[PDB]
Design a protein around this ligand. Structure first.
Ligand SMILES: *[C@@H]1O[C@H](CO)[C@@H](O[C@@H]2O[C@H](CO)[C@@H](O[C@@H]3O[C@H](CO[C@H]4O[C@H](CO)[C@@H](O)[C@H](O)[C@@H]4O)[C@@H](O)[C@H](O[C@H]4O[C@H](CO)[C@@H](O)[C@H](O)[C@@H]4O)[C@@H]3O)[C@H](O)[C@H]2NC(C)=O)[C@H](O)[C@H]1NC(C)=O
Ligand SMILES: *[C@@H]1O[C@H](CO)[C@@H](O[C@@H]2O[C@H](CO)[C@@H](O[C@@H]3O[C@H](CO[C@H]4O[C@H](CO)[C@@H](O)[C@H](O)[C@@H]4O)[C@@H](O)[C@H](O[C@H]4O[C@H](CO)[C@@H](O)[C@H](O)[C@@H]4O)[C@@H]3O)[C@H](O)[C@H]2NC(C)=O)[C@H](O)[C@H]1NC(C)=O
Ligand SMILES: *[C@@H]1O[C@H](CO)[C@@H](O[C@@H]2O[C@H](CO)[C@@H](O[C@@H]3O[C@H](CO[C@H]4O[C@H](CO)[C@@H](O)[C@H](O)[C@@H]4O)[C@@H](O)[C@H](O[C@H]4O[C@H](CO)[C@@H](O)[C@H](O)[C@@H]4O)[C@@H]3O)[C@H](O)[C@H]2NC(C)=O)[C@H](O)[C@H]1NC(C)=O
Ligand SMILES: *[C@@H]1O[C@H](CO)[C@@H](O[C@@H]2O[C@H](CO)[C@@H](O[C@@H]3O[C@H](CO[C@H]4O[C@H](CO)[C@@H](O)[C@H](O)[C@@H]4O)[C@@H](O)[C@H](O[C@H]4O[C@H](CO)[C@@H](O)[C@H](O)[C@@H]4O)[C@@H]3O)[C@H](O)[C@H]2NC(C)=O)[C@H](O)[C@H]1NC(C)=O
Ligand SMILES: *[C@@H]1O[C@H](CO)[C@@H](O[C@@H]2O[C@H](CO)[C@@H](O[C@@H]3O[C@H](CO[C@H]4O[C@H](CO)[C@@H](O)[C@H](O)[C@@H]4O)[C@@H](O)[C@H](O[C@H]4O[C@H](CO)[C@@H](O)[C@H](O)[C@@H]4O)[C@@H]3O)[C@H](O)[C@H]2NC(C)=O)[C@H](O)[C@H]1NC(C)=O
Ligand SMILES: *[C@@H]1O[C@H](CO)[C@@H](O[C@@H]2O[C@H](CO)[C@@H](O[C@@H]3O[C@H](CO[C@H]4O[C@H](CO)[C@@H](O)[C@H](O)[C@@H]4O)[C@@H](O)[C@H](O[C@H]4O[C@H](CO)[C@@H](O)[C@H](O)[C@@H]4O)[C@@H]3O)[C@H](O)[C@H]2NC(C)=O)[C@H](O)[C@H]1NC(C)=O
Ligand SMILES: *[C@@H]1O[C@H](CO)[C@@H](O[C@@H]2O[C@H](CO)[C@@H](O)[C@H](O)[C@H]2NC(C)=O)[C@H](O)[C@H]1NC(C)=O
Ligand SMILES: *[C@@H]1O[C@H](CO)[C@@H](O[C@@H]2O[C@H](CO)[C@@H](O)[C@H](O)[C@H]2NC(C)=O)[C@H](O)[C@H]1NC(C)=O
Ligand SMILES: *[C@@H]1O[C@H](CO)[C@@H](O[C@@H]2O[C@H](CO)[C@@H](O)[C@H](O)[C@H]2NC(C)=O)[C@H](O)[C@H]1NC(C)=O
Ligand SMILES: *[C@@H]1O[C@H](CO)[C@@H](O)[C@H](O)[C@H]1NC(C)=O
Ligand SMILES: *[C@@H]1O[C@H](CO)[C@@H](O)[C@H](O)[C@H]1NC(C)=O
Ligand SMILES: *[C@@H]1O[C@H](CO)[C@@H](O)[C@H](O)[C@H]1NC(C)=O
Ligand SMILES: *[C@@H]1O[C@H](CO)[C@@H](O)[C@H](O)[C@H]1NC(C)=O
Ligand SMILES: *[C@@H]1O[C@H](CO)[C@@H](O)[C@H](O)[C@H]1NC(C)=O
Ligand SMILES: *[C@@H]1O[C@H](CO)[C@@H](O)[C@H](O)[C@H]1NC(C)=O
Lengths: 136, 107, 106, 90, 122, 222, 222, 222
C-alpha cells in the first residue's frame, strides 16, 4: 500500500550541488513508528549502489552512509511531511545516475483490536527514480 | 569490507530448465541478513527473497534461496520466459549495505 | 453519618423522553458517589461510579455528573427496562449511607 | 481548620511502614520484606484532611530545603520536639 | 472476576444467631487493598450497610449494629462470614456479600454477590 | 515554619506557632510522624503521556532529600532510563541509600531518548519524587518512584514497558512494548489494565513480529 | 526501645520507659555515653580458625553503622583481604571516615581466597564489627576491627599474618606466614604468643626456605 | 565547651556553663545562630604573597566541616589550583555539597606548582576556610573561599589571576597575569585595585606580547 515518489533531479554542473526529494503516502507517517529510508542510485548500464539511509526517530534518527558518498552526500528527512531528501555536494560527472528512494515498509496482519504495519531492514518499496545528470 | 561477487556473469538456459546463481561474500554472514533482487529495464528491482530463505510476498514458489557463511544461492526450479531478468545479491551486515554487480539470465 | 437526600421521590416520564434525578449530600462527597438501578428480585446494578464513569456494560444513554454536595443522573431517552428505582450511594464516609430511591415511572 | 479543596480524594489509606534469630541481619529478611501493612478509612474526615495538610506543608518544606546545606535531612522532627519544649519551658 | 456466593439457614427463629457465609472464588482473601463487606436489604426500603472485615482481619461495624454483629474470616478456605445475634422479625432481608477496593482505579467498583434471603419468624 | 497536623478525638487540626495549647501533650518523640502520600489520591492523571508533562529539566539548582517513616501503596510508580540523542545519560545514578519505592502496583518503565536541557529533572508543581523512605526533589536514573507530598504530625509489581522519543520536550511520542520487535501506539485513554489485556491477546494469539522488522500496532479508534 | 544503663552509687540499673524516676537527674548531654565493648571479654574463642566461623555472607541486606564515644582495648583484632577464586574482591572498600580500631594488641591479618556467596560479610550472632569509633554490621576490606557490642548509659601492634584457602566456607584451611616461602600449618590450639615464639626460633635458627620452593612446617602434635 | 554569645539590650555577653541565668529566655531554636566572620576584618594582610604563608601541608589528620547560617561579604577570596612538579594534583576535589563562598569582591585565583608535603592544606593559625555555608579545616581544589572564624550565639567578582612557582614552600614567587604571554612581577605592596589599574593601562595601550615569547613587566620601584 506504501508509495514514494522522487523529484528534484535534472541537470546540474560538476563542482555544484543539488537536493533531491522523495515524498510518499500509504504508511503511518515516515518519522516515527516507521522504517528509515534509503537512497540507492543506478547509473544506466550499472547495478544499484547504496548511498545511505536515515533511521526513524524511534531508532535514533541517525544516518548510515555508504563509503562512496562519505563526506559528500547527506541523507535527511522533513519530519511529519513524509519527505526524504538527499543533499549531494561536490558533484562530479561520475555521479550521473538514476536516484531512487527506498523503503522497508508495507502492511502487516490485522486483528479485531486494530491495524498493523512492518518496518524492515531491507527494501520492499522502491520509487520510480529521478535522473540526475552531472555534466559540463 | 563485506563485498558480494556473483557467478556466473551470464546464465544460459532454455525456459523450463532449472537455473542457479551464486554469490560469494568476502565476509561470513548470518542467513537473516541476505536478499536477492530481480530487475528488468524500466523497473526498480523486486525483492524476491530475504533473510536468505524467506520469500518476499507476491513471489512464486519456484524462487527459493539458500546458503550460509560466505556462500549463497538463488535457485529457480524451472526458469520461465518472464524470469529472464538481471539478478542481484544484497546483504545487510547488521549496518552497512552491499549490492552484487548484476547477473544476466538469458535463453 | 451523611444523610443522602434524593428528589423527586417519583419521576413519571413518557417513553422516548429523557429524565433527570437529583441526589444531595449532607457534607461534601468529593466525587465519591455511585448510582445503582434497582428492579424487583435483583441485586442493584451499578451504573455510574466516581460520579460519572460508566460501569462495564452500561449503555451510553446513561450519564452522570456532580461534585461536592450536588449530584445528578440523566437518562437521555428512556427505553423499556429503564423504569426502575434509582439509588445514590456515597462512599466518602464509612457508614456507607444511601439515598431513598427514586421511582422512575412511565 | 483544614479545608480540602482538591478535585477529588481517595477516602482511604493503604499504608506501609517499618516497625528468635530474626533480629540478626544475617538471618533476618531482605529489604523488600521489612515492611508491614494495613488499611485505614476516613474516620471523621481524617484522611481527606490529611491529604490537604500534605498539600499545604509542601511550600514550607521546599523553602526550608532551599535554605539548608544537608544533602539529606532526617532532623525535621527532632527540631520540632525541641521547639515544643522551649515554648513551654524556655 | 471474583465471584461471591452467600449461603445460610434461610429461616431462623427470634433470639437465634444468624450465620451467613460468603464463598470467595476467582480470587482470594489476602488480596491486598480490599475490604470484604456485608449489606442488608430491608425489603421495601433502601439499603443499610452492615460492616467490613479487612484483608488483614481487622473489623469495623455500622454503629447501629455494633453490639449485634461479628464479622470474621478464614483464609485457608477462602470464606468470610456474618454472625448476627439476637435476631427478630425486623431483620428479615436479603443479605448481600460484596468486595470493595482501596485502589484508586477500582475505588468506585463493587463486586456484588447474588444475595440470600433470610426470614426471621416464630 | 513547616505546619504540623494534630490528631485529636475530634478531628485533624493544624498546630499554631503563636498559640500554645496546654492540652496538646507530647509524651515522646515516637508520637511524631513523617508521612509520604501519593498524588494519585488527589485524582491527578497517571498515564505516561500526561505524567511526563509535569516534569522538566533545570540547572543551577542542587537536589535535596527528606525522610519518611510511613507512606502509601502506589497504584502507579515510574522508572526512567533516558538518554540524550548522542547516547549519554540524562539522569544521574542514584546515590547510596536510595532504593525504589517498596509498594507499587504497576511500574511504568520508560526507556528512550530526548533533549535533556538541565542537570536534573525536577517536578514542576513542586511535588516530590518518592523513593523508599526518602522524598527527593529530583529523578534518579533507573530507580522506581511515586509522585507525592509529605505531611508531618502528632499521632495520638506488573512492570509495563514503554519506549519514548523526544522525552524531555512538549511534543513527544510513546510506544507500548509487547516484545523486542512488537509495539503498540500509546494513547492517553489507555489504562494499565487495558495495556495488560492487549498484551495477553496479542501475545497469546501470536500477532507478533516473525520477521526481523518491527510490527507496530494501532488500536482501533473506537 | 534501646535500654540505657544508669550508674548509681549503688549499682548499674536499667532505665525503664514506663516508670519515671524523679531522682534520675540528667544535667547535660555530656552525661550520656556510648561504649563499645569487645566480645573477647566474654570468653569467646579468638583464634583465627574459630573466629571466622562466626562470620558469613549475605545479599539483600544493606550495611549500617553507629558511633562510640569510648571503648575497650582489644587483645585480638582482625584485618581481612579476601578475594574470589577469579581474582575479584569479596569485601567492599571502606568508605570515608572508617578507620581501623585504635587500640589492638595482636592483629590477625588474613589474606586469601574463597567463595563469597553474598554482597557483604555479616556477623552471625548479630555482634558488630568495631572500627575506630563506629560499629558496623559489615566487614570492610583491609580495615582492622574488633568484634563487639554497644552499651548506652547515664554516667553519674605485633601483626600476625595468615594465608587462607576456602575462606567463606565451613571446611577451610590456614597457614601462619613466617616468610614469603615459609609457612606453618595453623591449629586452633595455638595462641598468638605461641606463634610469635615459633616465628623467633624458626627465623633466628635459619630453618626457612633457601630454594625457590615453599617450606611448610607441621608442629609436633605434642 | 564551645562558648555562646548572648545578645542583650545592654551588650554582648558570654554565656556561662556554671551560672544559670534565669532571665536568658530561649523561646525557639530560631534564636540560635551560627555566624561566619572573615579574618580580613581583624586587619590580617590579604595580598597573595603574605596570605599563602599562613597555609601549609600536613598528613595524618583528616579534614572536617561545620555549618553557617549567616556570614560576611568578603573583600578578598582565594581559589587555588596547585599541582606537584610531576603534574599530579596537590589539593583534593571538593566533595558534593561544597560550593564557593557566595559574596566575594575580588577573587585571587592562583594557579601553579610547588612541593606539597602532606595530604591536605591546613590553616596554620587554626582558622577555617569558609565555603558557601560550611567552614572547613582544609582547602579544596578549584573552590573559592574566604579565611575566617565561627561564632555561635543567642540573637534577641573581578577575578584576578596569578601564576605561582614553589607554592608550598617559604621562598616562592608570583606573577600577575594580564594575558597568556603577558605578566607583571608581583609584590606585597600591590593592592587589588592597583593590579586592576595596571591591567587597564597595559592592555588598553597595547603593551603586551605580540611575538610568541612571554613579556614580563617589572614595576618601577617608586
Ligand atoms: C496542592 O493543591 C492545588 C489544588 O489542587 C494544586 O494546584 C494545581 O497547580 C498546577 C500548577 O502548578 C495547575 O496545573 C496547570 O497549570 C497551567 C499553567 O501553567 C502552564 O503554562 C506555564 C507558562 O505560562 C508553564 O510553565 C507550565 O508548565 C504550564 O504549561 C494551566 O494552564 C493548566 O490549566 C489547563 O490544563 C488543565 C489540564 O488538567 C485543564 O483542566 C484546565 O481547564 C486548562 O485547560 C493547569 O491549571 C493545576 O490545575 C492546579 N490544580 C487545580 C485543581 O486547580 C497544587 O499544585 C498542589 N500542590 C502539590 C505539591 O501537589
Ligand atoms: C505479556 O504476556 C506474556 C505472556 O504471559 C508475559 O510473559 C511471561 O512473563 C513472566 C514474567 O517475566 C515469565 O515468568 C517467569 O519466566 C522465567 C524465565 O523462564 C524462561 O525459560 C523457561 C524454560 O526454562 C521458559 O518456559 C519461559 O517461557 C522463559 O523463556 C522463569 O524462570 C520464572 O519461573 C521461576 O520464578 C518465578 C518467580 O518469578 C516462580 O514463581 C517460579 O516458580 C520459578 O521459580 C517465570 O516462569 C513467563 O514465563 C512469560 N511467559 C511467556 C509465554 O513468555 C509478559 O511478561 C507480558 N508483558 C506485560 C507487560 O504484561
Ligand atoms: C549475648 O549472650 C548470649 C549468652 O552468652 C549469647 O548466646 C550465644 O548464641 C550463639 C548463637 O547465636 C550460640 O552459638 C552456637 O549456636 C549453634 C547453633 O547454630 C548452628 O546451626 C545453625 C543451623 O541450624 C547455623 O545457622 C549456625 O551458624 C550454627 O552452625 C550451636 O550448635 C552451638 O553449640 C555447639 O558448639 C559450641 C561451640 O562453642 C559447644 O560449646 C556446644 O556444646 C555445642 O557443641 C552454639 O550454641 C552460643 O553458644 C550462645 N552462648 C552461650 C553461652 O550459650 C549471644 O550470642 C550474645 N549476643 C551477642 C551480640 O554477643
Ligand atoms: C619474625 O621474626 C623476625 C625477626 O625479628 C621479624 O623481623 C623484623 O621485623 C621488624 C618489623 O617489621 C623489622 O623492624 C624494622 O625494619 C625496617 C626495615 O629495615 C630493612 O633494612 C635494614 C637496612 O637498612 C635491615 O637491617 C632490616 O633487616 C630490613 O631489611 C627498619 O627501617 C625499622 O627501623 C626504623 O623504624 C622503627 C619503627 O618501626 C624505629 O624504631 C627505628 O629506630 C628506625 O627508625 C625497623 O628496624 C626488623 O628489622 C625485622 N628483622 C629481621 C632480622 O628481619 C618478623 O617481623 C617476625 N614476624 C612476626 C609475625 O612476628
Ligand atoms: C585570635 O586573635 C589573636 C590575636 O590577634 C591571634 O594571634 C596571632 O597568632 C599568630 C600565631 O598563630 C601570630 O603570628 C606570627 O607567629 C610567628 C611565630 O611562628 C613562626 O615560627 C614557627 C616556628 O617556630 C612556625 O611554625 C610558624 O609558621 C611561623 O613561621 C611570629 O614570629 C610572628 O611575628 C613576626 O612577624 C609579624 C608579621 O606580621 C610581625 O608583625 C612581628 O613583629 C614579628 O616580626 C607572628 O607573631 C600573630 O602575630 C598573632 N596576632 C597578634 C596580633 O599578635 C590568633 O591567631 C587569632 N585566632 C584565629 C583563629 O584567628
Ligand atoms: C584586563 O582588561 C581587559 C580589557 O577590558 C579585560 O578584558 C575583558 O574581560 C571581560 C570579562 O571576561 C569580557 O567581557 C565578556 O566577554 C565575552 C566574550 O566575548 C568575546 O567575543 C566578542 C565577539 O563576539 C569580542 O568582542 C570579545 O572581546 C571577546 O573576545 C562576552 O560574551 C560577554 O558579553 C555577554 O555576557 C555579559 C556578562 O558576562 C553580559 O553583560 C553581555 O550583555 C553579554 O550577554 C562580555 O563582553 C570583555 O569582552 C574583555 N574585553 C577585551 C577587550 O578583551 C580583562 O578581563 C582584565 N583583566 C583583569 C584581571 O582585570
Ligand atoms: C513546543 O515549543 C515550541 C517552542 O519552543 C513551539 O514552537 C512554536 O510554535 C508556534 C505556534 O504555537 C509557532 O508560531 C512558532 O514559530 C514555533 N517556534 C519554533 C522555534 O518552532 C511548539 O509548537 C510546541 N509544541 C507543542 C506540542 O506544544
Ligand atoms: C559443608 O557443607 C556441605 C553442604 O553444602 C557438607 O556436604 C554434605 O555433607 C553430608 C555429610 O554430613 C553428605 O551426606 C552430603 O552428601 C554432602 N553434600 C554435598 C553437596 O557435598 C559438608 O560436609 C560440610 N563440611 C563441613 C566441614 O562441615
Ligand atoms: C626555607 O627553609 C630552608 C630549610 O628547609 C632554609 O634553608 C637553610 O637556611 C639556613 C640560613 O638561615 C642555612 O644555614 C641552611 O644551610 C639552609 N638549609 C638548607 C637545606 O638549604 C631556607 O633559607 C628557607 N628560606 C626562606 C626564604 O625562609
Ligand atoms: C529479545 O532479547 C532477549 C535478549 O535480551 C532474547 O533472550 C529474546 O529471545 C529476544 N526476543 C525476540 C523476539 O527477539
Ligand atoms: C509473518 O506472518 C504473516 C501473516 O501471517 C505472513 O504473511 C508472513 O509470510 C510471515 N513471515 C515469515 C517470515 O514467516
Ligand atoms: C619477600 O618479598 C619482598 C617484596 O615484597 C622482598 O623485599 C623480600 O626479600 C622477599 N623475601 C624472600 C624470602 O623472598
Ligand atoms: C637448603 O637447606 C637444606 C638443609 O640444610 C640443604 O640440604 C639444601 O641443599 C639447601 N639448598 C640450597 C639451594 O642451598
Ligand atoms: C589565550 O588562550 C585562549 C584559549 O584558551 C585563546 O582563545 C586566546 O586568544 C589566547 N590569547 C593569546 C594572546 O594567545
Ligand atoms: C613587537 O613590538 C615591539 C615594540 O613596538 C617591536 O619592536 C617588535 O618588532 C614587535 N614584534 C612583532 C612580531 O611585530
Amino acid at each position: 500500500e506504501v508509495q514514494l515518489v522522487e523529484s528534484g533531479g535534472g541537470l546540474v554542473k560538476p563542482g555544484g550541488s543539488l537536493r533531491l526529494s522523495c515524498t510518499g503516502s500509504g504508511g503511518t507517517g515516515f518519522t516515527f513508528k516507521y522504517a528509515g529510508m534509503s537512497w540507492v542510485r543506478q547509473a544506466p548500464g550499472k547495478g544499484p549502489e547504496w548511498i545511505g539511509r536515515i533511521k526513524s526517530r524511534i531508532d535514533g534518527g541517525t544516518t548510515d552512509y555508504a563509503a562512496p558518498v562519505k563526506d559528500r552526500f547527506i541523507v535527511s528527512r522533513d519530519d511529519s511531511r513524509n519527505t526524504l531528501y538527499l543533499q549531494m555536494n561536490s558533484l562530479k560527472t561520475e555521479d550521473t545516475a538514476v536516484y531512487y528512494c527506498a523503503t522497508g515498509s508495507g502492511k502487516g496482519p490485522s486483528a479485531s483490536f486494530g491495524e498493523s504495519y512492518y518496518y524492515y531492514d531491507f527494501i520492499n518499496v522502491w520509487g520510480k527514480g529521478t535522473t540526475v545528470t552531472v555534466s559540463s | 569490507e563485506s563485498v558480494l561477487t556473483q557467478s556466473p556473469g551470464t546464465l544460459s538456459l532454455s525456459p523450463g530448465e532449472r537455473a542457479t546463481l551464486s554469490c560469494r561474500a568476502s565476509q561470513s554472514i548470518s542467513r537473516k541478513y541476505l536478499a536477492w533482487y530481480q530487475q528488468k529495464p524500466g523497473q526498480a528491482p523486486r525483492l524476491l527473497i530475504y533473510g536468505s530463505s524467506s520469500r518476499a510476498t507476491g513471489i512464486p514458489d519456484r524462487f527459493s534461496g539458500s546458503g550460509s557463511g560466505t556462500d549463497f544461492t538463488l535457485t529457480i526450479s524451472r526458469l520461465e520466459p518472464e524470469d529472464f531478468a538481471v539478478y542481484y545479491c544484497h546483504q545487510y551486515e547488521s549496518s552497512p549495505w552491499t549490492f552484487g554487480q548484476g547477473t544476466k539470465v538469458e535463453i | 453519618e451523611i444523610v443522602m437526600t434524593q428528589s423527586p421521590a417519583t419521576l413519571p416520564v413518557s417513553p422516548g423522553e429523557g429524565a433527570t434525578l437529583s441526589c444531595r449530600a449532607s457534607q461534601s462527597v468529593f466525587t465519591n458517589l455511585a448510582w445503582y438501578q434497582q428492579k424487583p428480585g435483583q441485586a442493584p446494578r451499578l451504573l455510574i461510579y466516581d460520579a460519572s464513569t460508566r460501569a462495564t456494560g452500561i449503555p451510553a444513554r446513561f450519564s452522570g455528573s456532580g461534585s461536592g454536595t450536588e449530584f445528578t443522573l440523566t437518562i437521555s431517552s428512556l427505553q423499556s427496562e429503564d423504569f426502575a428505582v434509582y439509588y445514590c450511594q456515597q462512599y466518602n464516609n464509612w457508614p456507607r449511607t444511601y439515598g431513598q430511591g427514586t421511582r422512575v415511572e412511565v | 481548620v483544614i479545608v480540602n479543596a482538591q478535585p477529588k480524594c481517595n477516602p482511604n489509606l493503604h499504608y506501609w511502614t517499618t516497625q528468635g534469630l530474626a533480629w540478626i541481619p544475617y538471618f533476618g529478611p531482605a529489604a523488600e520484606g521489612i515492611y508491614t501493612e494495613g488499611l485505614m478509612h476516613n474516620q471523621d474526615g481524617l484522611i481527606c484532611g490529611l491529604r490537604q495538610l500534605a498539600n499545604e506543608t509542601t511550600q514550607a518544606l521546599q523553602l526550608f530545603l532551599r535554605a539548608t546545606t544537608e544533602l539529606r535531612t532526617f532532623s525535621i522532627l527532632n527540631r520540632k520536639a525541641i521547639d515544643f519544649l522551649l515554648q513551654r519551658w524556655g | 472476576q471474583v465471584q461471591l456466593h452467600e449461603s445460610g439457614p434461610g429461616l431462623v427463629k427470634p433470639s437465634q444467631t444468624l450465620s451467613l457465609t460468603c464463598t470467595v472464588s476467582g480470587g482470594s482473601i489476602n488480596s491486598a487493598g480490599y475490604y470484604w463487606t456485608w449489606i442488608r436489604q430491608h425489603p421495601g426500603k433502601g439499603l443499610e450497610w452492615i460492616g467490613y472485615i479487612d484483608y488483614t482481619g481487622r473489623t469495623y461495624y455500622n454503629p447501629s449494629l455494633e453490639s449485634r454483629v461479628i464479622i470474621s474470616i478464614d483464609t485457608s478456605k477462602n470464606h468470610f462470614s456474618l454472625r448476627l445475634t439476637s435476631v427478630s422479625a425486623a431483620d428479615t432481608a436479603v443479605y448481600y456479600c460484596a468486595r470493595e477496593s482501596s485502589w484508586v482505579s477500582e475505588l468506585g467498583r463493587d463486586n456484588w454477590g447474588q444475595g440470600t434471603l433470610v426470614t426471621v419468624s416464630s | 515554619s513547616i505546619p504540623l497536623g494534630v490528631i485529636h478525638n475530634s478531628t485533624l487540626q493544624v498546630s499554631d506557632v503563636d498559640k500554645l495549647v496546654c492540652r496538646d501533650k507530647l509524651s515522646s518523640t515516637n508520637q511524631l510522624r513523617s508521612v509520604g502520600l501519593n498524588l494519585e489520591g488527589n485524582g491527578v492523571a497517571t498515564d505516561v503521556p500526561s505524567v511526563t508533562k509535569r516534569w522538566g529539566f533545570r540547572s543551577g539548582v542542587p537536589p535535596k532529600v527528606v525522610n519518611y517513616e510511613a507512606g502509601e501503596w502506589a497504584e502507579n510508580c515510574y522508572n526512567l532510563e533516558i538518554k540524550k540523542p548522542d547516547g549519554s545519560e540524562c539522569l544521574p545514578a542514584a546515590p547510596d541509600g536510595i532504593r525504589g519505592f517498596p509498594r507499587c502496583r504497576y511500574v511504568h518503565k520508560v526507556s528512550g531518548t530526548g533533549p535533556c536541557a538541565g542537570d536534573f529533572a525536577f517536578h514542576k508543581e513542586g511535588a516530590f519524587f518518592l523513593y523508599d523512605r526518602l522524598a527527593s526533589t529530583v529523578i534518579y536514573r533507573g530507580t522506581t518512584f511515586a509522585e507525592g507530598v509529605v505531611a508531618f504530625l502528632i499521632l495520638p509489581s506488573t512492570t509495563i514497558r514503554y519506549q519514548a522519543t523526544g522525552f524531555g520536550t512538549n511534543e513527544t511520542e510513546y510506544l507500548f512494548e509487547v516484545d523486542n520487535l512488537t509495539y503498540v501506539q500509546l494513547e492517553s485513554r489507555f489504562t494499565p489494565q487495558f495495556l495488560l489485556q492487549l498484551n495477553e491477546t496479542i501475545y497469546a494469539s501470536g500477532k507478533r513480529s516473525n520477521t526481523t522488522g518491527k510490527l507496530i500496532w494501532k488500536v482501533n479508534p473506537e
